């Protein structure tokens, strides 16, 4: 029985190595990254793998891994999939953890833009659930952490981090964790997935995937929202996405929305992501 070495990109950042059978499943896989993460709510989560165009993929836990990296390497990274819109709702607290530190990488990374005063919160939030409460002892008037909160660090983002950190004497690690996310939940950008587009005029938006509905981001002046039940029919062909809108009561007819994608693979990655967030978000 034929195995293949698989190595894991774990939310900390520290790589987990292990082996599956060449013909596994992803699901294979990814139960053996849960057990690793002691993590019993693994629905929220999902391994991603860099492809060939160079980009994300979900790992379909349904379908052979070889089927799916064909070419690349067996090298994933461990993420959230389906951010909760009420994290307070998940049942473990382990579950809030790692979701905190999937959110920490979407603020580092600027994927999940935040005010300078959220950014010094959630920092604040995080320090105090990571080294517990404020020491002066290891904080001079010229304290810089360890810890990234900000695709661009400043002096003043760090005194601010410090300042509130002080405010959270006695805060056990669950109850910040608890803090940084009844916070990072109500950003506009929380759980929004992103996707380059044009639309039925070749201009240039962005379609954004999360929980509620799809999101349409034109000029800013116009963002268009579809909740999930408006949405009728998601379909791809060729690099085209289409939108099937039910009609507003007494119309006879749903409205179509047309985009391009920069390519096939673009349009069936948008796809199969907006039937699964759709799907989960029905049953939720
Ligand atoms: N007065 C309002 O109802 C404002 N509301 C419009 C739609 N909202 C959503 O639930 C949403 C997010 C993506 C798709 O739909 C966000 C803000």
């Not at 034109?218 to 039940?229: Q, S, Y």
């Not at 009728?232 to 099937?244: C, E, G, M, P, T």
């Amino acid at each position: 029985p034929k195995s293949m070495q698989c190595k894991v990109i774990l939310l900390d950042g520290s790589e987990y190595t292990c082996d599956v059978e060449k013909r596994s499943r992803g699901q294979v896989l990814f139960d053996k990254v849960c057990e690793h993460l002691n993590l019993l709510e693994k629905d929220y989560f999902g391994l991603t793998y860099r492809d060939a165009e160079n980009q994300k993929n979900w790992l379909d836990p349904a379908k052979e891994i070889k089927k799916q990296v064909r070419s690349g390497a067996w090298h994933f990274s461990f993420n959230v999939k389906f951010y909760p819109p009420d994290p307070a709702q998940l049942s473990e607290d382990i579950t809030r953890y790692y979701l905190c530190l999937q959110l920490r990488d979407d603020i580092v990374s600027g994927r999940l833009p935040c005010s300078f005063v959220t950014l010094a919160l959630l920092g604040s939030y995080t320090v105090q659930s990571e080294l517990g409460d404020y020491d002066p002892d290891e904080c001079g008037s010229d304290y810089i952490s360890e810890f990234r909160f900000a695709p661009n660090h400043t002096k003043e983002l760090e005194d601010k981090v410090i300042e509130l950190h002080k405010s959270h004497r006695g805060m056990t690690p669950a109850e910040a964790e608890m803090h940084f996310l009844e916070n990072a939940k109500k950003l506009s950008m929380y759980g929004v997935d992103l996707h380059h587009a044009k639309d039925s005029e070749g201009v240039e938006i962005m379609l954004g995937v999360c929980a509620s509905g799809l999101l349409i981001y034109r000029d800013r002046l116009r963002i268009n929202r579809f909740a999930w039940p408006k949405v009728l029919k998601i379909s791809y062909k060729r690099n085209n996405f289409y939108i099937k809108i039910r009609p507003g009561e007494f119309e006879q007819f749903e409205s179509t929305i047309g985009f391009k994608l920069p390519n096939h693979r673009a349009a069936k990655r948008l796809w199969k992501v907006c039937v699964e967030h759709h799907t989960f978000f029905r049953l939720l």
